[PDB]
C-alpha cells in the first residue's frame, strides 16, 4: 500500500511525501508527531493519509532555515523537548480571580506562576524571536498552552521538577525588547584619577541582580583605587518605562501602611533544606493580594523573602552629590 | 570594628574592599562566596580579614567585562548557580578501570557520565568560551569537578535531578570548535527544477541528528517537487576528523561479529513509564565495554536502545549515484 502526508515544523509551510506500510515512521521520513503524540516507531497507519505532521529529525535545507527564523538558534533536541512539552502541560490550568489571571498549582509549576505573572505587568514588551511573540499574544488573548510550553522549553526546563522563578524570568526577558527610549547611566570615580561613566540601555537599563530597593541602587559604593585613594560606583541618570530588582531569597518587612513605590514582588518560600515554592504578590488597594497559584490572599503586613521586585517607570538624576 | 577583602569573579582580578561589622555582606557588596559556602547574610565575620570573596551581585564595570570574555554572555543568576554547583559536585567520584575514567553514580548524574565519557573520545576539540576549556583542561588532567559543575551550569541542570544526555552532549558542543578541516555536502534536486548543493563545516559537519548509521546517513530521501515531479535529499561529499550520530531511544541489535565501523555508543535504559537511565559503550578488542556509571561490563551481543552513536573520520564521495 501507499500513502502522502503534509510534513511540516512551524504549521506555516508544508511538503508532501509519499509513505508505504512496511517500513517505520523513523526509518522513512524521521522524528514525526501527530496531533501531540510521537509516532516514530509506528507503521504508517492506513487512515492518516493527507494529515498534517510535525517533523524534528531529517529537516531539509528550506525546513531547517524556516525553523532558525522562527525560533531562533536552538540546539537539534529543541523541537522534540518542545512537542513533548506542549502534550505535557495541555492538562493545566489558568484561573481568573476578579481578572487576574494565574497558573494552577501542578507538578511543582509555581515557579512558573510566579514568572508568567510577572511579565503580565511587563508593559511595553515585544519579544525578538517570532514563535515566542505569537504564543505571547495567544496567551494575552486567554490561550496559554504555547508560551508556557516555549519558557519551558528554553528555559530547558523538565516537566514535573521544580525551578528558580529569577533564572527563568532573566532568560526569557534575554529573549525580549523594549517598545521605547530607556537609559540607565553609572558613574565610576576616582577624586584623583577621574570620573568615568558606563551608559545601558533597552531591557538592560530596565532591570538589576543584586539590590531590591530604590534607595539602596541609587546608593554610593566604595572600595580602594588603583591609587591608593577610594573608588566610588553611583546611578546618575536613570529613565526607564518600569524597573525589575531580583535579588536572592532576603527576609523583608512588607507593609502597605509606608505606601511602597513597588506595584508587585515574587517570594520564596519554605526552608532552605528542603526547597522549592513560589509566591506571587501585588499591591492593589491597600493590601498585598498574595496569589498562590490560584488561591489568593490578604495582609497588610507581611515578613518574607523576597526575590524579584517591580517599580514603575524610573526619572531621576543624582541631586548635587 | 574594620576588615579589608579581596573581592574577585574570575581568580585573575582582585579588588580591595573596606568592610564594618556592623551590616551584612548583602548590604555592604553582594552575593558574596568564601571557599564554596554562600555568607551574604553574615555579619563579617573578625578573621577573615585579606581573605579572597567571589562575588556575584553588584558587579563593577570591569567585573562585568572581565565576567564577560571568560564566561561569555550568560544569564545574571550564572555565578551563584555555578558557585553553588561547585560546592554540591565536590563529593563526586571518578573512578579508572583500565585507564579510561568514568563518574560514579551519584544523585541521577548518569546522564553526565554519558556525556563525558563521550567527550573524552572526541579529539581535535577546542572551546571557545574560555572558562571550558580551562576547567576541560583541568578534566583532562584528572580533577574534573569544573568541568562537570560548568556544564551543568549552562545546561541549567539542577542538583538531584536526571536529564537528557543527547541535549546535554548537543549543548556543550554548541560552545566548542574544530581544530581541523571538515566538511559536509548535501544534495537537493529534482530532475527538471535543477540541482542545489548545501555545505556545512566544523562541528557541523561532524554531527547529525536523524539517523543512527552511516547508511542511512547516505542514502536518498525523496519526497514530492514543486513542480509536481519528485525531490531527492542525498549527501555526496563528507569529510570529517570523526562522526557523532544521534537519535531518540532507538532499539537495535548491536553485534561485534559483523565488526561495525563504529568506535562508542550511548543507550537510554529503562521503560518510558519511568525514564532516567543512561549507559555508555565503547567497542575495544573483540568486546563492547558497557559503563554503568563505575561498573564496567562486557557481551559480543547486545539488544539496547542506541542513542548517540561515534564514528571515525569519513572520506567519501557519492559513487555514480
Ligand atoms: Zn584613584
Ligand atoms: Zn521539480
Not at 516514530?40 to 524534528?56: C, F, R
Not at 487576574?100 to 510566579?114: E, F, G, H, T
Not at 553611583?234 to 532576603?250: D, R
Request: glycine share 6%; aromatic share 10%.
Amino acid at each position: 500500500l501507499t500513502i502522502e502526508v503534509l510534513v511540516t515544523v512551524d504549521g506555516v509551510n508544508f511538503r508532501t511525501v509519499v509513505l508505504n506500510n512496511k517500513n517505520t515512521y523513523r526509518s522513512q521520513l524521521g522524528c514525526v508527531f501527530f496531533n501531540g503524540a510521537d509516532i516514530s516507531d509506528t507503521i504508517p497507519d492506513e487512515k492518516q493519509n493527507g494529515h498534517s505532521l510535525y517533523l524534528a529529525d531529517n529537516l531539509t535545507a528550506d525546513e531547517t532555515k524556516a525553523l532558525k527564523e522562527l525560533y531562533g538558534p536552538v540546539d537539534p533536541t529543541f523541537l522534540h523537548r518542545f512537542y513533548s512539552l506542549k502534550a505535557a502541560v495541555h492538562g493545566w490550568k489558568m484561573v481568573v480571580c476578579d481578572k487576574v489571571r494565574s497558573l494552577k498549582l501542578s507538578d511543582n509549576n509555581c515557579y512558573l506562576n510566579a514568572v508568567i505573572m510577572t511579565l503580565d505587568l511587563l508593559k511595553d514588551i515585544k519579544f525578538v524571536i517570532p514563535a515566542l511573540q505569537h504564543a505571547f499574544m495567544k496567551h494575552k488573548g486567554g490561550d496559554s498552552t504555547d508560551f508556557i510550553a516555549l519558557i519551558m522549553a528554553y528555559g530547558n526546563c523538565t516537566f514535573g521538577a521544580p525551578d528558580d522563578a529569577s533564572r527563568l524570568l532573566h532568560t526569557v526577558l534575554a529573549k525580549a525588547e523594549l517598545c521605547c527610549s530607556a537609559r540607565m547611566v553609572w558613574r565610576e570615580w576616582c577624586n584623583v584619577c577621574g570620573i568615568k561613566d558606563v551608559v545601558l540601555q533597552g531591557l538592560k537599563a530596565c532591570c538589576y541582580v543584586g539590590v531590591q530597593t530604590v534607595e539602596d541602587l541609587r546608593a554610593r559604593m566604595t572600595y580602594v583605587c588603583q591609587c591608593g585613594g577610594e573608588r566610588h560606583r553611583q546611578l546618575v541618570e536613570h529613565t526607564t518605562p518600569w524597573l525589575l530588582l531580583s535579588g536572592t531569597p532576603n527576609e523583608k518587612l512588607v507593609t502597605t501602611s509606608t505606601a511602597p513605590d513597588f506595584v508587585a514582588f515574587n517570594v520564596f518560600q519554605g526552608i532552605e533544606t528542603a526547597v522549592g515554592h513560589y509566591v506571587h504578590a501585588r499591591l492593589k488597594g491597600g493590601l498585598i493580594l498574595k496569589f498562590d497559584s490560584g488561591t489568593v490572599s490578604k495582609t497588610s503586613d507581611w515578613k518574607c523573602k523576597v526575590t524579584d521586585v517591580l517599580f514603575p517607570g524610573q526619572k531621576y538624576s543624582s541631586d548635587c552629590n
